[PDB]
């Protein structure tokens, strides 16, 4: 099916505290293979992933390079939107960018992007064109004249379309054991008495990968999503993923209750019913 | 692979 | 692969190859005696790119990029590289090819 | 344009030779090549904003690449050995990318004389 590859920045300025820390984490669908801190010992690209592991050692050497001088980067980035916003120099602030690209069934190229946001409100992105820049506030203009001139756009969209996707399949074709594989969730019901009157009745999704998944309850084919405790999905640990839903029941209407779990690796939506 | 571009903001 | 002959007027065509995956191409020449200069740059996502006298080629697949300069004259005698920066830290020269333009 | 200094030395092995590059101003990147042969060229050290970002080429020992101010930078060689002349290069380019115009200098002509 479809793929992707994304990546993630953070830095974070530490005022008196030091420098700036920065880290960053790369994604394939679900699954992190690669890592960066600033402050921890081996100042190095780690590898997160088994098929990761056999990329010689001219890989990692100029990928920590890479993003080693994105660091220093945003460090003159913190300084100079703290002059836009006209901020004193003691206040923490932060710097998240996201990129990536996505492919297809065939491997084709589908879509590119780049979104850069300033203490956890969009900043600037890159629009689906790979053409122009979309400026949030009065501030996000002068980085969108400044990266207009630089034809930043130009040298963003080469990466995207070119060694983005060029990467991204080299890492599936190493990563077919795990990366392409679906493991349906694994379902199961529980009751609790909530008291004499009523009860409390989960539906659950066990070690189940990727993360999208829709799990929804129905009163005699009538959807509850009124009376339903949702839970946002959550990791396991091992690479897969968890999923829970309650609802109150009457102490004896049990069997007209059914949950409903949608996933990519069933063939068909579980109907589940007590 | 990487390839966030730097062109100073 | 390390110099060519071309008369006056004539077109030339040079080649180089890179190894690595890049996002942009650039091509440049050191006159004898002075500093490279800039050329033209061709991005990754392009296959052909003109500036004046100045025609370069870009393929992907076969890692390889070509320049054609129309209507050369004495001056365009100079070494040639090819400049291949697979982001946008890292950037790698070619060994460079030697043009002597004949009177 | 680009300016280096000197623009030749010749010395005598074991001294300190020290070479001068005023970039473009506004510039936010130098770049520090050597040159062998007149075929391709070798990467030494690059700087963004006065900050180190690759040195990978400079030699493991006596090789020491500075930058002051972001008006000037500085290479070099603490103990000179004849293993070490080439010509030495300067360039600049402005935000500091490498997918950019890279503006060059004259070069400084070094040769060491055992």
């Known amino acids: 099916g479809s793929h992707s590859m994304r990546y993630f920045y953070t830095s974070v300025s530490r005022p008196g505290r030091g420098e700036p820390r920065f880290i960053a984490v790369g994604y394939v669908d679900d699954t992190q293979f690669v890592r960066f801190d600033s402050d921890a010992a081996s100042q190095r690209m780690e590898p997160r992933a088994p098929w990761i592991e056999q990329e010689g050692p001219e890989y990692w050497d100029q990928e920590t390079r890479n993003v080693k001088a994105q660091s220093q980067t945003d460090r003159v980035d913190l300084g100079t939107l703290r002059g836009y916003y006209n901020q004193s120099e003691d206040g923490s602030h932060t710097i998240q960018i996201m990129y990536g690209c996505d492919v297809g069934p065939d491997g084709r190229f589908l879509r590119g992007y780049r979104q850069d946001a300033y203490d956890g409100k969009d900043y600037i992105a890159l629009n689906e064109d790979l053409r122009s820049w979309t400026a949030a506030d009065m501030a996000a203009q002068i980085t969108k004249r400044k990266w207009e001139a630089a034809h930043a756009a130009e040298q963003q969209r080469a990466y995207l379309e070119g060694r983005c996707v060029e990467w991204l399949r080299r890492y599936l074709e190493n990563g077919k054991e795990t990366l392409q594989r679906t493991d349906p969730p694994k379902t199961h019901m529980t009751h609790h008495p909530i008291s004499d009157h009523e009860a409390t009745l989960r539906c659950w999704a066990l070690g189940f990968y990727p993360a999208e998944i829709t799990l929804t309850w129905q009163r005699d084919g009538e959807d509850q999503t009124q009376d339903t405790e949702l839970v946002e999905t959550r990791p396991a640990g091992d690479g897969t993923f968890q999923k829970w839903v309650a609802v109150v029941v009457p102490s004896g209407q049990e069997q007209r209750y059914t949950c409903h779990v949608q996933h990519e690796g069933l063939p068909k939506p579980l109907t589940l019913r007590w | 692979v990487v390839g966030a571009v730097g062109v100073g903001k | 692969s390390w110099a060519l002959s071309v008369h006056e007027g004539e077109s030339v065509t040079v080649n180089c190859s890179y190894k690595?995956?890049?996002?942009?191409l650039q091509w440049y020449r050191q006159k004898s005696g002075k500093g490279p200069a800039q050329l033209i740059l061709i991005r990754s996502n392009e296959r052909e790119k003109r500036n004046g006298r100045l025609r370069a080629t870009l393929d992907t697949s076969s890692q390889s990029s070509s320049l054609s300069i129309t209507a050369t004259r004495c001056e365009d005698t100079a070494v040639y590289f090819c400049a291949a920066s697979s982001g946008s830290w890292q950037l790698i020269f070619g060994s460079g090819t030697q043009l002597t333009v004949m009177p | 344009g680009v300016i280096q200094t000197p623009r030749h030395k010749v010395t005598g092995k074991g001294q300190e030779a020290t070479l001068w590059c005023e970039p473009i101003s506004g510039h936010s990147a130098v770049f520090w090549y050597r040159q062998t042969i007149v075929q391709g060229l070798e990467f030494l050290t690059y700087f963004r904003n006065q900050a180190p970002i690759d040195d990978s080429g400079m030699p493991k020992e006596r090789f020491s690449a500075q930058m002051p101010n972001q008006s000037h930078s500085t290479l070099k060689i603490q103990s000179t050995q004849p293993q070490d002349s080439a010509v030495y290069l300067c360039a600049s380019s402005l935000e500091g990318t490498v997918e950019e115009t890279l503006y060059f200098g004259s070069g400084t002509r070094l040769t060491v004389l055992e």
């Open positions: 690595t995956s890049i996002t942009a």
